[PDB]
Each structure stands twice: as C-alpha cells, then as structure tokens.
C-alpha cells in the first residue's frame, strides 16, 4: 500500500509506541532505498489473511523497562537493541520519565498488535536520488571526533547556531541526520497498534493483591481506579483518543492505512562510502550524545 521498507529511522527521536502528534513512530524518516501483492526486486512482502492480533502486558518500574519494551518494536536486525540512548528525545519518553519520577505509583503497559502485512529485505542496494545527493555533500571527516573542538555535544545543544559550531562541519552532518535519521528499516510488520499506559496507586495494587485477583489479568480484562494514557499507531487520527467509538472506528481505519508496528533496522553507515563510514559513526555518536538524555 505505502512503502515503508528502507525508510530512515532516528533512533534518538524514535518512539515505536506512538506520539500524540504523529500517527507513526516519530523516528521514521523518508525512504532511503529505491525499489522496483507485487514483490519488489531484492526483498519480499507478505500479506496476512486477517489482522494478526497479539497482546503483551508488562510493568514498567523505571525508564530501563520502558526503553526495553520500546526496543521490542524497534531493535536491530536480530532482536538486539539499538542502544545509544534510544528514544531518549521522544515526547513519550520524557512524559514517562515525569510520570515515573513520582515513584509513589506503578505504571503498566499493555500492547494490542493488529498486524496486517510483513516486509523485508535479503542480503548492496540502490539508494534514492536525494539520499545519494545528500551523501555527496558529506565530508570524509567528522570534526567533533576531535575532543578539543569548538563544537561539542553540550555546546551544540546549548547553541547550535553559535560561531563555534558553524565553523566546524558538524551542522552539515546533523542536517543530514535530521533529514534522514541514523538507521534504516530492513524488516517491518505494519498494521495497527494500541498501547495503554496505566498509572495506579500502590495502595490500590496492594488492595488487589489482598483480594487475590491478578493485577495484570485485571488490567487486561478491564481494558481498579487508574489513570490511562492511550497511544495509537496506524490508521487515521481520532479527535479524542479516549472514547469507545474512537477505538471502534480507528480499529477499522487501520486496514485502510497500515503503518509499521514492529520493525528491525540497520545502521546507515552500511550505505555510505567506506571513507565516510567511520566519520558518520562518530557523527551519530555525537548526535545521540547531544540530543539524547544521559542524565
Ligand atoms: C536498481 O537495482 C537493481 C537490482 O537491485 C538493478 O537491477 C537496477 O539496474 C538498479 N537501478 C538502475 C536504474 O539501474
């Protein structure tokens, strides 16, 4: 329907569970690979007989659990996480940091996957016109790899338009990344996904444990006084994310407009010339250092 294979991905700004202003992962960037229901040359696309459904529930005790649950829907090829402060710039990451810093509450996350098709690539690929046209503008050397450097991660985050950074080539590299991301999708399951972030008081969870009913089972069956945030992937935006009819309608608009809900990616330096590969790796390290949040 819509080509998402080979699209760029910003793993710093990515968020494979959603964003209130975007109907897809905010890290998804325009397609980088050029290609030829109908199978492309060098890859494969398989359709599903139904909306393949799957549910997963997990308690998110800290930002590591949140980032790990996110890593299941956006990892490197082979299940291994991307790392390097993944998703640390996404809005849904700071919101969860704020909600978990309270530390008097337990947060759970439920995921309903409604996957409709699967796409992937085999083992040396054509790239789009704009991608090669932007790579041609890239130097062979990343300046900020030199630790003595006017432009640093903290300097770039404070003022990127400062003369210290404008003298270096760093703003060039960042622009490229800001346009194309840090990775590209080599495999993807597209369709729809509904994720609930549940925020409950520890007193009520103690009450549930006293009653004997399982907290996770009660949360799955219910979707017992909680705060609910709803994140949506795929289909058309519902003007009120918290309505039963909004759910019922978006679930059917998913088929019309599916979007990647669980994908495996590959670093972009595999697509760059060998001379620029190490410089680009340094550049993406600098990018994760400057935009990501280590403290
Ligand atoms: C794109 O790649 C295919 C094989 O992946 C190749 O056959 C084709 O020639 C390439 N495109 C052009 C315009 O040559």
Residue numbers in the entry: 465 to 500, 514 to 600, 605 to 704, 728 to 799
The paper states:
Toxoplasma and Plasmodium are the parasitic agents of toxoplasmosis and malaria, respectively, and use perforin-like proteins (PLPs) to invade host organisms and complete their life cycles. Escape from the PV, and therefore from the infected cell, for subsequent rounds of infection has been shown to be dependent on the perforin-like protein TgPLP1 (T. gondii PLP). We report structures of the membrane attack complex/perforin (MACPF) and Apicomplexan PLP C-terminal β-pleated sheet (APCβ) domains of TgPLP1. The MACPF domain forms hexameric assemblies, with ring and helix geometries, and the APCβ domain has a novel β-prism fold joined to the MACPF domain by a short linker.
